[PDB]
Design a protein around this motif. Structure first.
Motif, PDB file in Angstrom:
ATOM      1  N   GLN A 128      19.449  -4.504  12.597  1.00 61.78           N
ATOM      2  CA  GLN A 128      18.333  -3.671  12.245  1.00 61.78           C
ATOM      3  C   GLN A 128      17.044  -4.477  12.244  1.00 61.78           C
ATOM      4  N   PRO A 129      15.910  -3.824  12.447  1.00 60.45           N
ATOM      5  CA  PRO A 129      14.632  -4.534  12.404  1.00 60.45           C
ATOM      6  C   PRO A 129      14.170  -4.806  10.976  1.00 60.45           C
ATOM      7  N   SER A 130      13.288  -5.794  10.864  1.00 60.96           N
ATOM      8  CA  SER A 130      12.715  -6.104   9.573  1.00 60.96           C
ATOM      9  C   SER A 130      11.788  -4.975   9.149  1.00 60.96           C
ATOM     10  N   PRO A 131      11.585  -4.798   7.843  1.00 62.53           N
ATOM     11  CA  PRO A 131      10.720  -3.702   7.390  1.00 62.53           C
ATOM     12  C   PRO A 131       9.288  -3.966   7.805  1.00 62.53           C
TER      13      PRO A 131
ATOM     14  N   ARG B 240       7.664   0.212   5.021  1.00 63.03           N
ATOM     15  CA  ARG B 240       8.101   0.447   3.659  1.00 63.03           C
ATOM     16  C   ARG B 240       9.123  -0.586   3.198  1.00 63.03           C
ATOM     17  N   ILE B 241       9.187  -0.783   1.890  1.00 66.68           N
ATOM     18  CA  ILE B 241      10.220  -1.663   1.326  1.00 66.68           C
ATOM     19  C   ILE B 241      11.580  -0.969   1.420  1.00 66.68           C
ATOM     20  N   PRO B 242      12.655  -1.689   1.773  1.00 66.55           N
ATOM     21  CA  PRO B 242      13.988  -1.070   1.899  1.00 66.55           C
ATOM     22  C   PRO B 242      14.528  -0.503   0.596  1.00 66.55           C
ATOM     23  N   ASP B 243      15.394   0.510   0.712  1.00 68.58           N
ATOM     24  CA  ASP B 243      15.944   1.157  -0.480  1.00 68.58           C
ATOM     25  C   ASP B 243      16.763   0.184  -1.312  1.00 68.58           C
ATOM     26  N   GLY B 244      17.582  -0.624  -0.669  1.00 65.29           N
ATOM     27  CA  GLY B 244      18.431  -1.508  -1.408  1.00 65.29           C
ATOM     28  C   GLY B 244      18.322  -2.928  -0.918  1.00 65.29           C
ATOM     29  N   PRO B 245      19.097  -3.803  -1.534  1.00 67.30           N
ATOM     30  CA  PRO B 245      19.047  -5.228  -1.214  1.00 67.30           C
ATOM     31  C   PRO B 245      20.058  -5.638  -0.143  1.00 67.30           C
TER      32      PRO B 245
ATOM     33  N   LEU C  82       5.914 -15.761   2.789  1.00 65.17           N
ATOM     34  CA  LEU C  82       7.349 -15.776   3.044  1.00 65.17           C
ATOM     35  C   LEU C  82       8.104 -15.317   1.808  1.00 65.17           C
ATOM     36  N   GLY C  83       7.664 -15.789   0.639  1.00 66.18           N
ATOM     37  CA  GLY C  83       8.341 -15.436  -0.593  1.00 66.18           C
ATOM     38  C   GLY C  83       8.277 -13.955  -0.881  1.00 66.18           C
ATOM     39  N   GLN C  84       7.092 -13.360  -0.732  1.00 63.71           N
ATOM     40  CA  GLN C  84       6.968 -11.929  -0.983  1.00 63.71           C
ATOM     41  C   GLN C  84       7.882 -11.150  -0.053  1.00 63.71           C
ATOM     42  N   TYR C  85       7.783 -11.436   1.243  1.00 61.54           N
ATOM     43  CA  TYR C  85       8.580 -10.717   2.223  1.00 61.54           C
ATOM     44  C   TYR C  85      10.075 -10.965   1.987  1.00 61.54           C
ATOM     45  N   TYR C  86      10.453 -12.188   1.639  1.00 61.19           N
ATOM     46  CA  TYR C  86      11.833 -12.398   1.222  1.00 61.19           C
ATOM     47  C   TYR C  86      12.184 -11.495   0.042  1.00 61.19           C
ATOM     48  N   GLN C  87      11.300 -11.423  -0.961  1.00 64.20           N
ATOM     49  CA  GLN C  87      11.588 -10.618  -2.147  1.00 64.20           C
ATOM     50  C   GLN C  87      11.750  -9.153  -1.799  1.00 64.20           C
ATOM     51  N   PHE C  88      10.892  -8.637  -0.924  1.00 67.09           N
ATOM     52  CA  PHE C  88      11.044  -7.261  -0.483  1.00 67.09           C
ATOM     53  C   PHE C  88      12.379  -7.051   0.210  1.00 67.09           C
ATOM     54  N   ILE C  89      12.765  -7.972   1.082  1.00 65.54           N
ATOM     55  CA  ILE C  89      13.985  -7.738   1.838  1.00 65.54           C
ATOM     56  C   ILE C  89      15.207  -8.002   0.967  1.00 65.54           C
ATOM     57  N   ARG C  90      15.210  -9.126   0.229  1.00 66.13           N
ATOM     58  CA  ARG C  90      16.381  -9.503  -0.562  1.00 66.13           C
ATOM     59  C   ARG C  90      16.694  -8.467  -1.628  1.00 66.13           C
ATOM     60  N   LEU C  91      15.665  -7.834  -2.207  1.00 63.97           N
ATOM     61  CA  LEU C  91      15.817  -6.867  -3.293  1.00 63.97           C
ATOM     62  C   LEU C  91      15.700  -5.418  -2.837  1.00 63.97           C
ATOM     63  N   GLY C  92      14.679  -5.100  -2.067  1.00 66.11           N
ATOM     64  CA  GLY C  92      14.478  -3.712  -1.815  1.00 66.11           C
ATOM     65  C   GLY C  92      14.054  -3.010  -3.094  1.00 66.11           C
TER      66      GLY C  92
ATOM     67  N   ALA D  83       0.824  -1.206   0.000  1.00 68.16           N
ATOM     68  CA  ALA D  83       0.000   0.000   0.000  1.00 68.16           C
ATOM     69  C   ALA D  83       0.859   1.257   0.000  1.00 68.16           C
ATOM     70  N   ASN D  84       2.016   1.205   0.674  1.00 68.18           N
ATOM     71  CA  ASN D  84       2.959   2.320   0.645  1.00 68.18           C
ATOM     72  C   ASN D  84       3.617   2.435  -0.718  1.00 68.18           C
ATOM     73  N   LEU D  85       3.804   1.310  -1.400  1.00 69.97           N
ATOM     74  CA  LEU D  85       4.236   1.383  -2.782  1.00 69.97           C
ATOM     75  C   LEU D  85       3.239   2.159  -3.625  1.00 69.97           C
ATOM     76  N   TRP D  86       1.969   2.078  -3.277  1.00 70.07           N
ATOM     77  CA  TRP D  86       0.907   2.762  -3.991  1.00 70.07           C
ATOM     78  C   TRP D  86       0.564   4.109  -3.374  1.00 70.07           C
TER      79      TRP D  86
END
Lengths: 459, 459, 459, 459
Positions: free
Chosen positions: D23-26, D29-34, C323-333, C103-106
């Motif tokens: 650091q805490p998990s997001p 917002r999605i993080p700036d980088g990976p 888990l996959g989505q949240y991994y994708q958000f964290i792994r990529l940003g 939602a913050n992306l939007w």
């Protein structure tokens, strides 16, 4: 939190967010620098997707399935060079034990414990080694008699496997081919002998003809060769190219006289990776006794007790395939081998029987003696049909299958046939999938109002 | 809760509480019936424990380490038959790209995008194919000139790898060996020429000689053959056997003219599975241009655009090694290959330097150009020593190493040397492990009061 | 040692030497008894070979590649029932954190820490959840005003994804479709507003239209709907069906005004399993604030602090994709996501540009705003050609591709187009592979002397 | 030997020596980088540790264990979107084969080869689909008869699962609930019939009531519904919500008539992932015949011969669960299913009996008909007890169990009960761990001097 080298290949780079995966693979020259292993793995892996799935490859005779222990076993051997026999003498001994077992499968009368044979990459090497041995045996006979030996030839059916054209081309040995007809579907012994002379180094019957799926009658040839050698004194021998049948006949057809039970069968070659049930990279050749292997091409080395023959074209090579061959002998045994080949033939028989029920088709043969057969369009049907078996092959390609259509060899070259090979790992259930896909394509093709390009070329 | 079939092989059976594991492995005949996969896997696996571990085999030049991605890729291709090019045309194209990349590594001047070469199982096939091409080129020259062509020969150093005797034996081609002498540690070009005549099909210098680890000077050979051919009109070509150096020279010694930069170098062969960094089962051969491959031994098939040559001794075979080769090219690139070969040469150079410091040893050569070297006993030391290098080899076998001792080839057969090959996966830390074992073994041997049997054989 | 039960399924049985693999898979009734896991594993897997490989599936928009850690994470979560939020509250919290991030992306203006949204299996459920919310918001307004509320309608482009046809049919709500033309290639706002009345529950612009690959202009739609709402006070809202574009726009086109920045955009839906980079089984819907989600279709539960919304059509379901989505958000940003989508767009643009150079083709659009586009035959060229794009589809099927040809929706139903979707895991090298296969297929088709079956129907 | 980027994420970075794991998990917002995959793997995986282990989650009905082949099969299928049926047609057919097998498991008399049903994510979707079908059938009849159709209702027990509340709320359809008493512990048929009228779209008996674990008597409902329909002509049907029992009844109670054997049973729905033995993500719906599925909510597409109906709320979704179901059918068969569920019922029967032996407890029923039951405190004991079942739930949570305490629905809402669900993967040995922990926790609770808050809340 920007990673400035994220496209350049660092610890965070995603394979498909990198600059490398925006570039084509190297075609001409090696790249200047490296990439990460993941990028490189995908780049090579992804090129393998766009081609036939192995288990659906019905053109090939070569094994596409092994169970998990055999696969684990072989994968673990990936870094083992067989030829380093001094370092790995247990594998060298295993190799000889496999040769012993195979040679006994063919009713070898040799009484040495360490039977006269050799490991090969396939029937290609196995065939070529037997061919050279017969070549050297003939050269040596002709010299002791003072006869010349500078124009050697051999006789084979036109339905030969391409290795025999290489042998002829690579040794400058003349190949004499016996044509196929509808009356003579396998090597006719009488026709072969008319092509023989003082220069013929051997005749090559084939068990499991790749073009047709049938067996040359070796017993008739041996009986026929005997009277002719008594007539000529040419002392011409038989080398049986048993690329496929050598792992079929012993189990399903025990009483058929085709092997070292026969007087003139001095050597046999086979593809272990076909119906010997081992992943690509295995062949075998055996001689009837030590006396049929020329010293000029062979020596034996004693490792821990086993006399191991040292003949072969290749040198360093994968060892896993020996682990695979020995595992299969132990895991299955004779009964186990009988049932798997039994399955394959029954399935080939099932498909054969259902194909003939279909309107466009007539089988090349009423007997399936190997887990494969060929068929073609009813001559009546093809006259008014707008499609060929090349067309059906394409229809089947749209579903991931490969079922090859091709013209037969000499004197049947006007016949476009289709072949199906049933290997271990192709089930009755998969047969039902293929037959369903075929019936559908005939329906689509029977809808055609205009002839296909192959059909027009046939007019 | 008794299980009545526990020993007979049911789902509860323990492998080593079974009747079968009280029985020996099959030696002569296939078992009548089956066992479970666990029993059969153990029976075959357990025999492989009692021999050298591949990473400790320093006799071999052939790859025993690849990274985890290259291994996975190759393990995943275990059931891929290379030759099925219609069914797997992407691997067929990949194959052609490796040939291009290699042929460019050797400075091929061919203008085709699809360079002229062939896939092999190792240098064994690669060499034979170059030898046959050279053989056929000579036959046609001589026919065209009205000269005879029934007694051909070839010329090579006595430090030949056994594949050339295989070639000589299997094609009935005369092999002429140039001995090793104290004047030159490698092939002398002038002496090689004295063994040539109108029947010589090629001369074969070796890059990475197995007995010594050195390089025949090919440019020096090339310069003399140019003066000899102009004298004779014999038009004799060079085939370079670069089984190892073919993957060393282009990276560490780029300015050295040894490849298709040389006028008479018409073909080169290499073992991909030695220093091309790929698990067993890969070789490559290349020709200088299309015209040096005889029409008689090769045809082209166009797969997806790529002109792919269909020459080879083998037919069906593993394709995994092709996937591995292309992987390494991409994963490493030139720099990547360069630094890995740099590590291997340094470690070999390091060990070389440490061996010379030890009282009993002196090196065959002061120049290390490939990741291997040989040394021997100081003659003064050997005169009063009660042991030989065969004894050191045995002392080291007791720690799991295999480091071979052997006599040199002709005119140096009095020299018993020991060799160390430095492959990828042998680190400086492993060099120090081996050296420590040498100092220990030297000390144990110097305590001896009586001569070893091999020491007695030397008196 | 004959195993009397080898074929019937004991510990020694080989899969393809069993009676079971002589039988077809069950069609109507469950088998009476069991088999071993190996046989049953094979019977199910083997049926999946004879179909398109996902990585070559260019029809789909849905993720076919995730990295090795993402796969392991989700595979280990195979047995986690998301709906058990009391039992698995950390996942309950995680799901809400995904919703917050999306939602913050939007650019949601909601000021709550726990943003208002719901988990979905795909855009189907996500779209359906927003539509019922808009249906219910409208019912309550009309009820409150004394207006009737029994004949609801909504407005959408004909280029709708089938979910909105399910929506209209399963809730018996009238669908009003705005046709596509070459002059108006996306939803035209003026025409869209002409279909609104007191019963219009919402308008659905689409970001990433499946038929064309383009984005309906939502800003133009919002501005006109604002004026129309000001005219009527009917207060008609926008639900953005951003099935694909919702994970493209924030990263590649941040300045494009399409989301919760717009006044009348009260809810957005997206497929996580498309370009959210998650394997199948994820969709998302978000509302601009709590007041736009009716209490009638939702409740909140506080798990560990997180006010978690309890809305959805499905109940128990896999949790792995969260888990996959949240991994994708964290792994990529953000940077990471940007560079992955940039690759797919760059590759998609590359193909678009290459297709236009080919004589038979014209691209539907000159703008590539999502990693997919469509093209069709040049009308002049199609007039004389004997083949259609349906024929091109079949040609590419024989090399394993699936590239769909189809007619467009209303007022462009005469256009047979072909579409290509470029997902993560589809590289530049694969574009060239596909491009080669097309160049090849066009040439085979241009040799036709008679019209193909699809071409005759077009006349 | 300093690595300057160790803490920022390079090839050497340790996950928990990194800045990121400080650091805490997001959350928002999605993080700036990976980051690296390892860090991202740890961050997402580690949040899952602090919640119930699935095998100890005794609240859930949904499968938490499958054997190793079923897991791998599904895990390998992670990237297959079922809905791409044109691209994956063997799975479309497999899906059709599951529907047939289930419908026949429920004794469908439908005469088509391809039985009429749909794939679903669970009983949630399956129920809604049966519900909409019944809604549309009634709407169409009332139209044909000139009656109104804007006030639909349905009849169900108060022990409904929450989907029917979603269904009633989300389709604005009236729910008439038949209450539970000790006298009527399941749906009273007569009470169900008195609530039916011209507006009743169906009656929903439940097999495996989630609150209590019992089976509504469907045969009694059918018998009364027949006389009522014969009197009214209202033509009112039965839809069975059989989320659990649909995979228990056919095997353990084959002669109990609850399925398509009954005249008025026109559709049945089940959760594949509950007692169908498949990991989360599976449900099924079936109709008695094609005429009971409205054309407005369904269409069929022919795949390879199979007529597959296209009805559903979801669109793209995992296909892996179809493989698991099909695997389970083949691997287990009827006997296989019979014994697995028999194990589950015996173990629940065991615990049921052990709960009754304990002084504070009384079982809701003397019948365990599904592998689940509920009990509550003996009223005599509960008056003087200082604790409630909410206390017992908390104590067992300190040992990793989830055993839910909750109040029963209407007219039994003053009853706090606890339920235990026995899934496959819950053994007698695990039953013994649980019973012991209860006795211990009971011993601890009886030591209390003061009432717990829940105990006070009941006073």
């Amino acid at each position: 939190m920007e990673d400035l080298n994220f496209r350049k290949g660092d610890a965070k780079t995603d394979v498909f967010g990198s600059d490398r995966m925006l570039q084509p693979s190297p075609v001409e020259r090696i790249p200047d620098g490296p990439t990460t292993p993941e990028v490189a793995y995908q780049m090579v892996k992804d090129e393998t997707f766009a081609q036939t799935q192995p288990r659906l490859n019905l053109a090939t005779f070569v094994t596409t399935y092994m169970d998990d222990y055999a696969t684990k076993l072989m994968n673990e051997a990936i870094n083992i060079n067989y030829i380093d026999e001094t370092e790995y003498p247990r594998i060298a001994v295993m190799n000889g034990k496999c040769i012993n077992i195979v040679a006994n499968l063919w009713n070898s009368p040799e009484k040495d414990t360490w039977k006269t044979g050799a490991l090969a990459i396939g029937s290609s090497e196995a065939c070529m080694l037997g061919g050279v041995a017969a070549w050297l045996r003939w050269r040596k006979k002709r010299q002791a008699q003072g006869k010349p030996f500078d124009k050697p030839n051999f006789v084979i059916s036109t339905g030969f496997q391409v290795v025999w054209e290489k042998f002829a081309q690579l040794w400058q040995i003349e190949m004499r081919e016996v044509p196929l007809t509808l009356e003579k579907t396998t090597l006719d012994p009488e026709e072969a002998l008319k092509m023989c002379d003082e220069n013929t180094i051997c005749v090559v019957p084939i068990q499991g003809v790749t073009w047709t799926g049938l067996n040359d009658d070796v017993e008739a040839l041996d009986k026929a060769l005997d009277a002719y050698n008594a007539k000529t004194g040419y002392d011409i021998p038989i080398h049986v190219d048993a690329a496929s049948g050598g792992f079929i006949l012993p189990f399903l057809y025990p009483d058929t006289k085709w092997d070292f039970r026969l007087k003139w069968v001095l050597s046999i070659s086979v593809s272990g990776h076909k119906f010997g049930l081992v992943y690509p990279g295995l062949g075998w050749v055996c001689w009837k006794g030590k006396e049929y292997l020329p010293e000029e091409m062979s020596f034996s080395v004693n490792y821990l007790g086993a006399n191991i023959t040292q003949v072969g074209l290749n040198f360093s090579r994968p060892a896993a395939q020996i682990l695979g061959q020995y595992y299969q002998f132990i895991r299955l045994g004779f009964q186990g081998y009988k049932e798997v080949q039994y399955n394959s033939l029954q399935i080939a028989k099932y498909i054969h029987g259902e194909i003939a029920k279909m309107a466009p088709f007539v089988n090349y043969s009423e007997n399936v003696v190997n887990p494969l057969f060929i068929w073609y369009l009813k001559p009546e049907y093809a006259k008014s049909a707008k499609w060929t078996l090349y067309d059906l092959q394409d229809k089947l390609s749209q579903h991931g299958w490969m079922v090859p259509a091709y013209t037969l060899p000499s004197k049947l070259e006007d016949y476009v046939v289709m072949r199906v090979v049933v290997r271990q790992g192709f089930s009755r259930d998969m047969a039902d999938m293929l037959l369903g896909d075929i019936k559908n394509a005939i329906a689509e093709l029977e809808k055609l109002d205009f002839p296909t390009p192959t059909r027009m070329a046939q007019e």
